[PDB]
Amino acid sequence: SDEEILEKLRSIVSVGDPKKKYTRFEKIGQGASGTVYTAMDVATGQEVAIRQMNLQQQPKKELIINEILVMRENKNPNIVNYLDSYLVGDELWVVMEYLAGGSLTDVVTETCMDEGQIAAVCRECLQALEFLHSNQVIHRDIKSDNILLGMDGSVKLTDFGFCAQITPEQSKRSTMVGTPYWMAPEVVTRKAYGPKVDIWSLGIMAIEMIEGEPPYLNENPLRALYLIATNGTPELQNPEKLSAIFRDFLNRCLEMDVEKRGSAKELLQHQFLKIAKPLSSLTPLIAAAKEAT
Known part of the structure; x- marks a missing residue:
């Protein structure tokens, strides 16, 4: 009422x-x-x-x-x-x-991130995710638009309008709330998903940082979701340009088998994150993206 x-x-x-x-x-x-x-x-x-x-x-x-x-x-x-x-x-x-530095979307659409800068962003996002998941909160709409950036290179998650609080009695959700291009395939193929949907979405965000768009952006969101379900793990345009450790990190985020897919806690130990540059390294990209608008 x-x-x-x-x-x-x-x-x-x-x-x-x-x-x-x-x-x-x-x-x-x-x-x-x-x-x-x-x-x-x-x-x-x-x-x-x-x-x-x-x-x-x-x-x-x-x-x-x-x-x-x-x-x-x-x-x-x-x-x-x-x-x-x-x-x-x-x-x-x-x-x-x-946070005055705009969104990660501005950065990925206006600038070219290097692997050290990508690793820093992925680390900071996984820190938020590990905290939320340990607290039985699923964000459910992870995407570059929802990552805001400080002028100092701080990286922060925003928009809890779609989050879910889970319990041991009800540890899985079924509601489709996420943005289609970033949605894990199990959200559409099953009716039981958990925290690792946020890990899949983070993987798609890493694809944004590499290629400037999530897979299937140019497609109607209805078609994208069918493609996600039927294609599964998305293919990179130029995987040879990426380091072996980054390719491994992406593989662990975008695993089809939910059980095999990394948790946030597990992924925080990944060696890709160890090549992270200081967060200050993001400041020139943020300044450039802000100017470009």
Whole structure:
């Protein structure tokens, strides 16, 4: 019920108006998702991102309550920090850490990453994933669009609007929530998937970092999902250009057999990650991608 949704949100949020804590509001996006701003925390000077949503036109509000509750209780260095929230009448404000370097998509579409830079990004993402999975949280929409980058080369996962909380009683999910091109084949071929769907998606992201797009991007998402299910592990355009250790890492992320596919904990030990450059090595790519827009 709409009234119970509001009462639940009232309990979660900080009291009063967000304008009593945040100052220099500047709009950076608007849609059906709501309006997104950057702003400054009056007390700390911190630059923040603020999502403003009208609840009278938010169609799946249980998802927002879930998102806030999950983020609040699963803080991690490699996850964009949930900071606070406010509710004014029908208007919900969600205050987040802001990263000014844009998304990994901007980087992969505008620049050419080397293996050391790719390894650094994969490592940071797997750190977030190992934490979430150990906490029985599946992200379920891992893709370059959802990796935000700091000007210092920090790498952080965002958008928990699609995540799942699992239990030993119900350790597998069946809902198709992910973006088609990044979806593991078992999401469509079976009705029981687990945390390793995020590992598959990470593998596809590594393909983005190599080739600039996930496999089948040019195809209708409906066709892509059939292709994923029937082709299985995607083929690289030029696998000879990659190191043997990177090819091995990709093989372990994109294994068809879920049991054989690496977990996040296992993949954190992979020798591909050991060639990682410092995160500072990403800064020129981030600067270049930001300029290119």
